Design a protein around this nucleic acid. Structure first.
Lengths: 193, 45, 101, 44, 70, 119
RNA sequence: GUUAAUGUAGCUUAAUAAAAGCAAAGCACUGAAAAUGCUUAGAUGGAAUUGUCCCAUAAACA
């Protein structure tokens, strides 16, 4: 029986999404009471400070509009999390799959997950593994192959070779679902958020 | 949800008026804070 | 089969209210998740400006529970820290005396 | 330990009152001493 | 002193905030249930495949903490 | 001259009452019941009843407690029971709704203090 | 279509004599939490009778 292990890479969003109007009005309410409970040319200095914010380039809340189709680029999304998804081509079946590398019983699951990054990611960016319990097991047969879907969160985002010839795409949830055509893969999104 | 805990009101027992200012970080990120003085922005070196 | 130790969480933020507001918030989530919190201590201001830091005690954790919990904590954050930890009353001792007698 | 402890006296009082009505083997003080209409309600 | 209309306006927006927060709580609670069920479901999946692997896996990692993430 | 339970010194609520008016606040509904020593509810007023709730905007409200108090009083007045003993807990007594409901009983003529038995 | 699921509101073997109780949320409050007060939300997609069909849905076979 063929042995295969999959790593579900995760990246946290850099910047939070904008507040909803109901959040905004509550922000006004807490500010309004904040003034109520508070105890009691500066504008020229204030103008100098406010423009100093403008000159310094700020981190955009969402880079999707600028990136658009830069899926291979690591920072595909800033508002939401990212899942690394890398095409795996095989003779029996060629389908878009999650980062996968063989797994051996002697090597523990975390060690297998580390090898997936060391064998496929091959980049400075680092990921951390929390629990040794797998996040999903899905088997597709033609020959029967079982894939172990481990999970990984990105400690750092120092991606190397952003434009790998390999078809690596970072998809938060939606673009990921489309690629995962087989129902076994489609179910991989059960633990994904 | 980051905004789940970000949005809160001051329940402290009395305090001086705090004005909104941005602590601009060297990587371009910004964070809202309430400061005692009527400033506008702060810069992390 | 081994069980996690009691791990303290140090929440340091620019605003005293925000640090405490997150500190109380995590406790509420901890209580909902059935996480025991022994104490919610506050540290002195870091006089130089100042910074405010609050300890939220956490006791009891599991491998699966750890994975989900910290992930939730990351999203909940609007500076996180996770570290292993480092006068009795009259009734407490009276029971204590009998056991050792 | 695992079971929750009453944080309010009222909930215990409801539990205490419920038990009093419920029968017990030991001697106790008590022993010695359409659809369419509903739809209309929802509319109202 | 705030006028009754001012309190009415502040109360009105308070109702909107409370309604949304309760909706978030249900959504957040359901999200945790989905997260837990999937994670718990993942636990059972490999148990059928090979329970022996879990005996090592279920043991906690002492070196995992202290771990700080933003 | 009817008897009253004069014991239960260590146990609260006191049993020294011919009739006790117990008001129960549920998660969504508030109900008031008058019961005899036997515990049988002679007269019951509940917001869950269709007639009241159709005319009552929100099942749980301070005014709803006021409304049920007046409604129960009329049921009590027509029944002929004018005197009862109500012993709210300290926080229950502090509750404005219970105070408002009690005010309805007083204005409606219902008295929450019964007279002591005569020998 | 075969196997298999899933069908009162988070929970209940609450209910067919009247769609209930509990859990849960927010606000006031201040060590924290809790309590307390003011408030917020919801269902039988469903027919059986006790204390399986049923169509729908969605899976392995297909």
């Amino acid at each position: 029986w063929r042995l295969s292990g999959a790593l579900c890479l995760q990246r946290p969003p850099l910047i939070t999404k904008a507040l909803t109007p109901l959040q905004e009005e509550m922000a006004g309410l807490l500010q309004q009471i904040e003034v109520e409970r508070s105890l009691y040319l500066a504008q020229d200095l204030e103008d100098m400070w406010e423009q100093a914010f403008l000159q310094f380039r700020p981190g955009a809340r969402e880079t999707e509009a600028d990136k658009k189709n830069d899926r291979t680029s690591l920072h595909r999304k800033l508002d939401r999390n990212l899942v690394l998804l890398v095409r795996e081509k095989l003779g029996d079946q060629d389908v878009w799959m999650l980062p996968q590398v063989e797994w051996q019983p002697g090597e523990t699951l975390r060690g297998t997950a580390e090898r997936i990054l060391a064998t496929l990611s091959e980049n400075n960016m680092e990921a951390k593994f929390l629990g040794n319990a797998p996040c999903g097991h899905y088997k597709f047969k033609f020959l029967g192959v079982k894939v172990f879907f481990f999970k990984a969160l990105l400690l750092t985002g120092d991606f190397v070779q952003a434009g790998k010839k390999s078809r690596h795409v970072w998809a938060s949830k939606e673009e990921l679902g489309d690629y995962l055509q087989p129902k076994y893969l489609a179910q991989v999104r059960r633990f994904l958020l | 949800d980051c905004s789940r805990a970000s949005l809160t009101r001051l329940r402290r027992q009395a305090y001086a008026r705090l004005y909104p200012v941005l602590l601009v970080k060297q990587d371009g990120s910004t964070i809202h804070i309430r400061y005692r003085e009527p400033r506008r922005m702060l810069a992390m070196p | 089969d081994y069980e996690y130790g009691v791990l303290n969480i140090h929440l340091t933020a620019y605003d005293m209210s925000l640090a405490e507001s997150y500190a109380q918030y995590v406790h509420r989530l901890c209580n909902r998740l059935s996480i025991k919190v022994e104490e919610s201590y506050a540290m002195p201001t870091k006089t130089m400006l100042t910074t405010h830091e609050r300890v939220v005690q956490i006791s009891g954790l599991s491998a699966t529970f750890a994975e989900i919990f910290l992930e939730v904590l990351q999203s909940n954050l609007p500076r996180l820290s996770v570290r292993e930890h480092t006068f009795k009353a009259r009734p407490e001792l009276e029971e204590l005396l009998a056991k050792l007698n | 330990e695992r079971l929750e402890k009453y944080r309010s006296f009222e909930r215990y009082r409801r539990r205490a009152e419920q038990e009093a009505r419920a029968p017990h083997w030991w001697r106790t003080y008590r022993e010695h001493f359409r659809t369419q209409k509903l739809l209309e309600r929802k509319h109202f | 002193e705030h006028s009754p209309e001012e309190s009415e306006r502040r109360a009105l927006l308070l109702k909107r905030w409370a309604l949304f927060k309760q909706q978030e709580h249900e959504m957040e609670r359901d999200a945790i249930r989905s997260m837990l069920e999937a994670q718990q479901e993942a636990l059972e999946e490999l148990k059928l495949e090979s329970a022996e692997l879990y005996a090592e896996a279920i043991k906690r990692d002492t070196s995992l903490f202290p771990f700080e993430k933003e | 001259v009817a008897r009253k339970e004069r014991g239960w010194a260590t146990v609260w609520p006191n049993r020294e009452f011919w009739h006790r008016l117990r008001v129960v606040k549920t998660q969504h509904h508030v109900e008031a019941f008058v019961e005899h020593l036997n515990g049988q509810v002679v007269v019951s007023a509940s917001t869950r009843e269709w007639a009241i709730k159709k005319h009552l905007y929100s099942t749980r409200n301070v005014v709803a407690c006021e409304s049920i108090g007046r409604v129960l009083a009329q049921r009590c007045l027509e029944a002929g029971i004018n005197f009862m003993v109500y012993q709210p807990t300290p926080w229950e007594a502090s509750s404005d709704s219970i105070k408002r409901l009690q005010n309805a009983m007083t204005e409606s003529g219902v008295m929450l203090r019964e007279p002591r038995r005569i020998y």
